[model samples]
Target chain A: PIPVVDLGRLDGAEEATKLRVALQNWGFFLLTNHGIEASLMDDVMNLSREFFNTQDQVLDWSDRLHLRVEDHPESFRDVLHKYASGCKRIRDDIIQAMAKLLELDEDYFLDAPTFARFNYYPPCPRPDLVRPHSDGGLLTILLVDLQVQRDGKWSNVPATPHTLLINLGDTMEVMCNGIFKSPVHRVVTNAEKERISLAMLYSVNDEKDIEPAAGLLDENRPARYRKVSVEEFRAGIFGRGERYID
Target chain B: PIPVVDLGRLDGAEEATKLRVALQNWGFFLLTNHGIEASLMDDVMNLSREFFNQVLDWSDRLHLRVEAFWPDHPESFRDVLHKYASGCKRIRDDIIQAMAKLLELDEDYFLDAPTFARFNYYPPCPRPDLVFRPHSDGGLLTILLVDKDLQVQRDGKWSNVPATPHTLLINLGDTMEVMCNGIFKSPVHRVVTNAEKERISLAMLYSVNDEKDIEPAAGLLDENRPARYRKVSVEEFRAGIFGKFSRGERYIDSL
Candidate 1:
């Protein structure tokens, strides 16, 4: 089972330790008490499901709609806005905690770029809706669950209500100088039912250079990776389908 | 100078009258206080300029629904363009509501109206008149954000429409003329080339949904007036327009 971290308790030392360990070992966690209302979460999921149902649609494993907050459709305008704003708040908190862990400024990741993605998986005639891949963003806030690689075995993450699944991404791994891991994950299709999941992917701005935090480097700890912009990082991962960055 | 309509003031009696007169007479107007912020307008214009500024592949233009034709470059191109289009959609709704009010129809009369866009790119040409020849737009209303070189025809005369900063130029279309039973006109307009500077234009054309019927509104016709145009689904109307265009005929005249 993935470690569970209550977002409200992250301000304390013990919870911070748990988050640190979660990032270091599992590279993922089940986040609870994140202040986003359960009703809003449910509404977003229902609306997304309805949206998918209405669309007569697919590509790259499943049907998806990738849009900015302002680009959301009229029916989804209100609910999506509320949902995105809440996710942004949670992103802010998590980044702040990460900054504290790295002994960097609290607003270190404040200006990063973020976008929302709604993915719908229908019952596939075959299997494996998606192949194994690591996310390109610094972090991903998923309102659902999937299989995460652990010790050469793929482990299933069950859907738990009122909790978000948080995962480290490639950018965060580079930022933390490999102290944190980004788990490789994939989605397998179900035979009985369909599934809908929404994820908010967070990244540094395209122009901002990415490297290990200054505080994370010392005489004993040399630079683990060379510098690269978020654009370069994303291009490398998506362009070549490679995982780890040097 | 063209008639100027303050979009924010349209809720009042005076502005409504101004809108009606503008639609009736000039068939065009300078739309101001349109609710889209100046910064956003400026950003869109600059971004569009940069986009056209990019290639000879740029000599060609992409025409489709905004989302599908989204470009990948110029940093925040998709982000800013979508915001711009969303704002344009809002204005489209407002104008539709206003027009419905003017026609004494329900506010949601054209609620399902679908909009498509054209990104017209005109590189510098030696013969200015050789580019974008005279024609009437096919849709109901064309909300154009552009730089200069546009000319409108009236009474055998051509008038150059100046580019007013931060203001949108609205042109009623052939469909709109037919809908209003020719009470409003769709002006014949053309774009000429600048021998020096290239020009870019974004035309957001609002039209009836594909399966919807389009004809003169019942309220606009009486025993004395009768129906000036035959009823047709938007699909048929579009087909007729293309058929006429292919044969060098004027669709509006046919209507």
Candidate 2:
């Protein structure tokens, strides 16, 4: 079962210890009593839908320029057609929620220039067009509606109302050194409803030196990976498109 | 002065724009006609120096145990004492000759790792032990000899070799970042050489990622820092770290 943590009760020393361990052991966690208004979440999602459905030109531009989608058929290509739709405001709200959850100061929240977009999955005329792939960077996706398949053979991982599904990205994997997993999930195109999601990308400050924290390593467990700068890792990703690595 | 590059020499008419823009703008350049004597470099500064000078327990144990030293300091304090006796290797005959002529990476002799050490100075009869400050990561260093220092500094800007150097040391810096420029550099450090000369250290490492190509970011440069290699930008370099965003994704190496 996915662990659910109540942010409101996370005040005492014991709770603090539990929260830290949970964050360190598993990057994914659930927050209850998060104090963010449900209406706010609703607003964010509604805006995301509007952005996805409304903006066509911006999305098309990205599709044209994105090398990965253009070159590889099996690669995952979810387009956000509208660049500046309702996503801009929704992104701001999500950033605030992230800052609250991480206990980061407001300044840190500002550091994350949040961008929101509707991920468009064209009717996979051929089912294999989109393969199993994970989202990149520090990302959190709040599924506004259940993504159901028309053929009934495919279904997304079940999501409940008022619950947000958080996905980790490659940078977090490097930052945590594989301790926090970037969960693998994919979309199967359906002839029925268009799959829409509000993806909020939270990036660390560009100048900061990002490496696995030393405290993560101990006598029983030495560092499994070498320390690398964010620039170094970023360069690797662009140089080599998408490939599976252990 | 940094060398000027003509991207047209490398890329033909078709790929010129992309390659030229990537090189000139990124503040990084590639060296093709470069060669170095691998065996000679190894003989001058043995690779085992990394293990003996940086990893040995007796010399490095305390520093390793100290919370401040492990994640932040460029040099491992725990292993400094053990590495103090190591000496600077003579520059390869050909490479030294090139340096003498104020040339960088001549065709016959290529530039390997630019190595040096921080001969840390710790004051004597200390009122309080000096605490090292944290700085950027640069590269590796070997302790040649320890004269008099208490604790070493951590994470500071690069220090130039003193006029009257006390001990021989080997180190790497950000300029090497220009070499593998996009890859990792040595972590920054400060030394607390004590009053007693009992501590001597030697540090060394080959340019593990030097063979890789480095190009400048197209976005940062103007006409002055004209595009050099290709149209790769810092943002692009930053994005490369993701290596395909997926769960449990590792870095992708360019062939």
Candidate 3:
């Protein structure tokens, strides 16, 4: 089980240290008190279930909505809009939290673009088969718990009500100059019950050049990755999969 | 002269046009038929006055917001307070819809955004001139149910805001100014306390959720006029304002 950091207490130095350790040690942590109403969470989850049941899968037996506020039922659109704003707030606060942890300015990652992805994984006979990959963005906020590769073993993280799982992506890992870890994670489908999850993927703007923070690079530590733009970074990752992660 | 916009007729494009002018020019206006019953308005005023009569102090204010830090004495206080805040939220939504339409955006662009309220009680003082000094609110809009003590500054002059019946006072704030790309001003206003009579008012401040990054509307920006203010979340923006206010300066000026 991973540690749960309270987003409401990000102001305190105590929580700051906890957040630092969560990012530095596990690369993933559970987030609570994230300010989104539990009812809203239920609403999003139920609507996702309806989406998966109504809409017409893959090696993952997955039905996903690559949502960017598109045309949908009025209820669906309204709820998703509200949910997106709520998630955006969490992202902004998390950016501030990371900045505090890294001793960087609060606005260091303020302009990053955020996208919401809804995933529904149904029962699969072959639970052993999974997509083992790491996210390429800054941070991936997940509403459902799944499997994470920590240390040398695979850990099954169950979904907790009113909590989100925060996973640092390759972008953040590179920006922190290997100080922070972006763990390689995968989803092992359940054999009986279906799984529904939503992820808000945050990334730096494609046009902006991203590099390790200068403050993090000092006498002893050196830059592990070269400065690269998000456009080029995405291209390189697709060309050569998870081989880039140290 | 401050414009008076009737909320009852807001459905008409003409009324919305008037609202736009009011926001763009004076940044302050009188709102009428705002959906709250006249009796309810009177009830809230009486309740607020009752609260202040029992309590004594200037620079004394109770934050009557969405959550539970409410007064216990006035037995009917909590219920009426939430009712008043709920009514204020409706008015805020209507006005926000008007604002969105004014910018040629979707009418629901900012509907149902987060709102917070504060109850201000200004007691009669020997030195009433030093009452609440001139300052702009940090949120998007301030819906004020005020008496005659409030005055606004324009052209380096301060003028009294008349306390008309059943009409709420509306004013834009620092966040709205940034969203409108400086087209809508957030007027700096102060309270001129009375020597004999105490002043009591309810202010409902509406803003985007703390997570929202407020920036100039895309339609309002072009090559000729770039963004006047940098993007900032409401929480950070309010923090800056609160910090500057603590230091006796205006945060909007820093931008």
Candidate 4:
């Protein structure tokens, strides 16, 4: 079993070092006593559920889904919303906490806007059709209720009550210069319960002038990335249909 | 009077409309067909001049007047090499043709290696102390050569040149941004040229990116000034900057 850590108690010097190592290396870790109330999580999830069910046509107009629902009806029959305004408060709280724990400035934490999106997966007819696909950004999953799958694999992710499951994204991998692992994990479809996840992403800067700090490199480890502007990367992805620069 | 032009020539079409307006509004212009002898310019100024001048100690160690030799110089005396290099290329060939034709590249032109430099100056002994002051990049004379400076009496337009002998040394200016006019000018700088004519400098690159297209701003008027450029913009230049993120010649071709 992966060790469950309570961020509140790990304020001491010894535990602080361990926490830093865990965050730097793994990118994804569990948090208990995270100061976020279970009731607040329930309220947020309920709000998300209400918003997703009612705003299908609105989201369809936004075109962010890009026929993912239409193309893969069996495995991907879902509606997702890019909820920037609603998630701002939660994002601010988490970023502020991270800045304090990591000894970074408030401005540094808020260097760029936090991108938030809410995903709602409907009941899947066939659970086996959902293939494993990694998310594009860091994700924090707050389970308002017991999220279970039709198969026993729902337990693959630890479901401790009131704990947040954080997953790292590609940007974090670039920022850490590959120190942190951007693990690939997928969601299993459910016949009974709908799966709802609110994901938040942080970006560095648009100009591409900012890069992973050079001080992070050593003789044994060279920089794993070539410097590229976010605009160029976005253009390359849009024009060529691939995000990987290498 | 100089002719003003929209940079619609290089690409033979006015595609980069926004970039052209920015360039003209900014007052820098790009150049093409002015016919610089590339091999001769490179051999004489870049390779022979740089390799033959073995003032490594003066540059690296004795910090005396070393600012002339380097781009980010502090005291301003150490940059003599850079000053000479700037006078030869940025002044004689590049700025001259740019001023004569008011030419602007339809696209961002990539400069060859060692095509430009930061010129430094040292005044002769003591009418005024040789101190670094606030001025735009390059020197005052080069700004005049490119017809960039404005007459307070004439408004924010090009000022006429005053005939000074070799006393006036040509230097790089914020005109690089201006060449497509504000599309290409160097960052600002200030230098106090004392009575002494001694100067120094460090060379930089001016290569072009072959893959990218160059054109003038489509919105700018040809009636006000003939379109000398191919029409490009600050963002495109910025894209080139990021495309070739490293400093110097390599960035030019990618632009």
List, residue by residue over B1-255, the lDDT tens digit for candidate 4: 322332224233342342244234433332322232333333322332233130001111001111113443222222333344343454344343443233443322333321322222121222321212122332112322111011111232324323222222233343243333333333322332333343232223233333233343344436775544444443353333212111211111121
**Candidate 3 positional error at A129, Å:** 47
lDDT of 4 by residue, A1-246 (tens): 354555555555554454456556444556676556655556555665554242111011110010100011111122122223324444455445444454445445354434334445553232211023233333343343422121223234655665666655555455445555454454544544566655555544464442444555678767666565665443222110000111
Comparing 3 and 4 on lDDT, the stronger one: 3
Question: Model 1: residues >4 Å from true position, as ranges?
Answer: A1-246, B52-60, B67-75, B123-130, B245-255
Interface RMSD, in order shown = 25.7, 23.9, 26.2, 27.8
Clashes of 4: 84
Model 4's alpha-carbon lDDT is: 0.36
DockQ: which is higher, 2 or 3?
Answer: 2
State residue A32's C-alpha deviation in candidate 4, in Å: 1.5
Instruction: Report clash pairs, candidate 1.
Output: none
TM-score versus the correct structure, for each prediction: 0.46, 0.35, 0.45, 0.35
Q: For each candidate, what is the lDDT?
A: 0.67, 0.35, 0.66, 0.36
lDDT of 4 at A232: 48
lDDT of 3 by residue, B105-215 (tens): 777566345555666655554421221235667567899886534777778666777878888998998777877777777887766665446666778777666444777
For B1-255, candidate 1 gives per-residue lDDT tens digits of 578889998977998888889888778887888977777766766676565430011132434454255443323755676667778888877886888898887886565655566665555533211211366776778898876447777776677778787889988888777777777777777665544466667777776655447777767677787876778776666545433111111111121
